[PDB]
From Swiss-Prot, chains B, E:
Protein name: Pyrroline-5-carboxylate reductase 1, mitochondrial
Gene name, Swiss-Prot/TrEMBL: PYCR1
Biological or metabolic pathway of the protein: Amino-acid biosynthesis; L-proline biosynthesis; L-proline from L-glutamate 5-semialdehyde: step 1/1
Cleaved signal peptide residues: none
Classification via Pfam families: F420_oxidored, P5CR_dimer
Keyword field: Acetylation, Amino-acid biosynthesis, Disease variant, Mitochondrion, NADP, Oxidoreductase, Phosphoprotein, Proline biosynthesis, Stress response
Gene source species: Homo sapiens (Human)
Amino acid sequence: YFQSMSVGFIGAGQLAFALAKGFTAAGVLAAHKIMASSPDMDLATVSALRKMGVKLTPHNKETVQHSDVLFLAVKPHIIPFILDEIGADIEDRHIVVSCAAGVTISSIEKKLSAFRPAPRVIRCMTNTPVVVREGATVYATGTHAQVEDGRLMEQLLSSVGFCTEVEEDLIDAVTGLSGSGPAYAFTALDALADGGVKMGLPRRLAVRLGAQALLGAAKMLLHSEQHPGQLKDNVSSPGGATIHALHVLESGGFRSLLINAVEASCIRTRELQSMAD
Amino acid sequence: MSVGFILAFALAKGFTAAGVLAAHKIMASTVSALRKMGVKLTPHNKETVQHSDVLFLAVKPHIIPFILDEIGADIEDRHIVVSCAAGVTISSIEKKLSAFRPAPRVIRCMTNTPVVVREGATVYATGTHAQVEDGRLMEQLLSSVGFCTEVEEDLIDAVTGLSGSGPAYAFTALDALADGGVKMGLPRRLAVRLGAQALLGAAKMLLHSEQHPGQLKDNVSSPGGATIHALHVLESGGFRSLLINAVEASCIRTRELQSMADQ
Amino acid sequence: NLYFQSMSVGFIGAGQLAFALAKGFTAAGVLAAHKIMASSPDMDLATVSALRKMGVKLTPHNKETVQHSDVLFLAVKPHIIPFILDEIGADIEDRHIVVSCAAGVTISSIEKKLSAFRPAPRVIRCMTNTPVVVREGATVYATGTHAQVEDGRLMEQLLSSVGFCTEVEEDLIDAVTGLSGSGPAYAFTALDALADGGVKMGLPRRLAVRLGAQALLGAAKMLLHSEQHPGQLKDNVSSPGGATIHALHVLESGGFRSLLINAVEASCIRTRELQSMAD
Amino acid sequence: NLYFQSMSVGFIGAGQLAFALAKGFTAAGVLAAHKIMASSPDMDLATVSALRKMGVKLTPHNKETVQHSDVLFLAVKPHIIPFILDEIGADIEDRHIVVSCAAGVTISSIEKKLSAFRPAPRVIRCMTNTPVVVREGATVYATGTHAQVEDGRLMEQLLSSVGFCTEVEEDLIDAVTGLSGSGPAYAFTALDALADGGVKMGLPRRLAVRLGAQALLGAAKMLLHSEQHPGQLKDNVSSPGGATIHALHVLESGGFRSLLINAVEASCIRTRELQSMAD
Amino acid sequence: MSVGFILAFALAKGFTAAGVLAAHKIMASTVSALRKMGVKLTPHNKETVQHSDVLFLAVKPHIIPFILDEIGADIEDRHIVVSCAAGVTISSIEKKLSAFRPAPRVIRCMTNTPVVVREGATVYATGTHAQVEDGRLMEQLLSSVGFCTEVEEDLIDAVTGLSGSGPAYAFTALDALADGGVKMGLPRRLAVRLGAQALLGAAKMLLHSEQHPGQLKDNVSSPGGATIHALHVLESGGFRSLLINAVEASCIRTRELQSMADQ
Ligand SMILES: NC(=O)C1=CN([C@@H]2O[C@H](COP(=O)(O)OP(=O)(O)OC[C@H]3O[C@@H](n4cnc5c(N)ncnc54)[C@H](OP(=O)(O)O)[C@@H]3O)[C@@H](O)[C@H]2O)C=CC1
């Protein structure tokens, strides 16, 4: 559905690389329609992106001039410097998609609006699994984003994962759930593998089994019309190994730790922004 | 090049062991150890400044402003003033010295005691008027006693929490590891030696490896074995979270000390 | 100073420990890579191909390793050792020194198996660790009933080329396993966590890893070159009111010291179990 | 060596600290009991009658203590000190050295009050503890703005007769309060608990109390006469595998060390609050 | 009277400092310290027995049976064999020695390192053939380096848990107290001195007092004050229960060691 559209990344780190790789693997954009810029790009990222077909430049202004959709994939405190640098180069045609945690549409529009009125701004929160086209993305549309800009954004990010529109005031909470969530999963998978190794499994097999168990269970829940508590009941046979293991999770307050984590990440996201303003 | 001190012993021993500085090219302002090594010693902090090209400030965060008020009139355009004082900001030094002559060349250093065996961890930040070659000279000199790299000043608190306080974390761990060896039947001297050799060897393995520390943990924990059993008991006590707590607590205290220096 | 540079070394097992020792010995230059042979069941291991790239001879036949070797290291999971000793017992010759690195496996259990084939097998029990790969291992050994005096000296000379090495009574080896055998894994865990702490406080992860590892290496070296107690070095570096003593307090409040005692004890007890489960 | 045996000493307050110092001074023989006067609101205290039996002069009038004294100790609850200084400020003479043992009460707050009456009051701030009663106190002092050089020496000579004594900067006294000021109560608590442990394991309570107190006295003396770190002495006395290292493990698992850090900190912070609540 | 050793240094230093024994009347089987004090030294454990009247065994619980098998033929009717070896029961000593001559006079001692400054805590139990005057002589000799009293042998495990391990508890407490002093701003050397002086003074106050330790706690905790605030934080961590745990753990380990000696 995207024939001539070109995409740019300001930033070439973990998230920009994941999105660019997922977009190209999706085939929704020709790789040569993608440009990425950063001032000191790691030579291994240069090599991988070049082999992918992505165009590269140190000059953010070239990315702006190449792009129709412009992703801001720098650290949150870098956003206002970027907006000052490129603000005079924003055109009517641009959609500016901020991926930065915490950074409000309001703050981006106030910077850009000093240069040309009505910047079209979308704020999104995604996660690194876009790199395997299983990301979880939400976006909120800015004051001057045309209704079709949101639709275009959704169609584009839907090619690398789940994607849905939210009110901007949910994004910090999403950040604490699906933005940080992969790190919770990787922590859990490392520990589950340690557990399998303690009970006699080779590490390589433990890592594989644990990751496959998690992927399968998550897919079961997504494809099920059932409450996760009901799936827990379905697979916990009376007197069995699983309900014994669930008891030891409950005794250490397992559930409360995950709630603590979502809360901690969301709150930190709010604090950082309140320091930015 | 001449170097002066006003952690002081550790760097002078490390420098001289490195052969980067002759001992006598170094004046100071513990005394029998320095005099033995060949280090000139003087009580009058003013003599140290007149003698030196690169001037280290190794005094408590409380004794820096009084050191600067004393020797401020004596700083020349040639000097590089390198501050290792915990929590003393570049701003508070420049502010004091600028009253005497403008554009003082100031570098803030965050190093640790293992420079004394030339295995320190050092970062430095360059001040307003430090020329580019001043920071290159600093890196070259401090690289002779360990790792050295440049950082922004606003990361020195974090570095303090990690490699600044780090050796104390390790000394604590080695004392406890030795208590464990002794509980299980080892003589104390053997337990201390083995535990310290295990930490050094593991740190070197990581430093020479292109591998994540978790990957090295994976590689050495055989299935069902003694090591994975022991890792589990570490995990059940929240071992990892305590070390995060420590880096955080030391970094945060350093920010409080920077606040006092800036007031 | 015994001459051993021309002798042949075999490993039964081609895993992490065999790789580590073979790498350390060849990097020390004390043995030629073609003097080393290793046998293993599974060849599609990363360690089998690493041995191959070093120039070590690889084979699936344990007898061939035994016939090649003068010094024979046993570096397989413990419960495997009786099946190995049954398989190769008839191939042990008078020239062989058998060096068991199998954790928990006692000299007695080895000598009992091997004695059924030839009397007076020369056996040495070894406890070492993976940092021999960077020539900073921590190794202890105990000599068996028929080990000659020069066997112990040869073992000490060889293993000193890749780190600290000293003779102990056999009844210490289980505690050594809990301390320096498992010790590197405690250190890797600590370094991961310290780097997470550095990242929490604003450092890039690569720098935090480097700084934390350098801090631990340097502190460990300081202690080894000091004649001082680790508590004295802790005292010497903790300035009044400063950042370090504040961090040490939060370590103490979580019982940091007790966790490391708990770990040494747990590893040592598990090592004792593994022997008892064998016997 | 200053001569002070004939001088007169007053205490405003007749509580535990006044009793302890008066007892310690008289037991050291450095002052005559009739040279000491103490004033207090309530006379039906056990400490008032103990002072009486020692031969100390007791009175309800703080002015009379001031007129009697050359050295004047303030040993009342802190919030009382401003009302005392208002009451007796006009009676301070040039001969007086005022020695405040009120915890937290700063030299500044005292000098400000007393300066309204006569300029240059000679003030010393003291932090001591109850074991001066057995001449084993731990005392520090800081000299005020108008304290002569000999005032500090006189104070050190006097307080050294009842224990350790040294001069400090005033900004250490709050931390000293948390450590050796409160320290005896930590020790009494520990001794009660250790004796309960002895009773649990079969000892009669009287013996357990004696053995535990003697163990602590002896260990403390060993440390003071050693040039060694307490961790080194801990190492020296903990035999491998033995009873002591097993007990030290259970101490560590409850975070014993952190509780004592917590206590010093809590006492020091409370002392800082009490000054701030005053100011 | 002649005394021999085969904790050994601590008693010999304490005895000689006490003037109860001339240094040369003592033979032993750390070496420069003893030789300096005037203590005869010999490698051959047999020479020590021939020299001595009262014979101390200061070796690991593991090295006692081999010491007894060595010198057993040399024990005479005059000897009192005093064992300080941790966990070695009177029964296991008498059993070994009785093979050589019947009725060996054996005393089991539980003392601690502060005998080196003559403030030890010692209990002793008399063996099957120890005459009444043997235990009186023991009490008189050990009273010169600290407290000494007789107990039943089945209380020595408890005493071990309390005053045997006690000094290690105190060294640990003094290190932590000093960390606390340092955290709050004190120099380390001052913090160590003050904390040790506070413990010594408090222990002496209790020893000289006719008062319960809780009464002394009450007497020194002023209402609302710094001390009662600090006691509360001790209570919230279960401080008292940890010390009970410690005495129990050391006593129980001593019973396990007695079981090994008796097997
Ligand atoms: N990683 C994740 O899981 C997620 C990240 N995000 C958000 O995405 C943004 C980036 O995250 P991440 O990719 O992890 O951070 P990285 O640190 O991995 O990459 C940061 C990038 O910003 C670049 N950069 C810095 N200054 C400039 C500049 N002046 N002009 C252009 N590029 C510059 C860096 O350049 P150089 O290459 O020269 O260093 C680097 O390429 C953050 O705001 C984060 O919140 C959102 C969801 C999840």
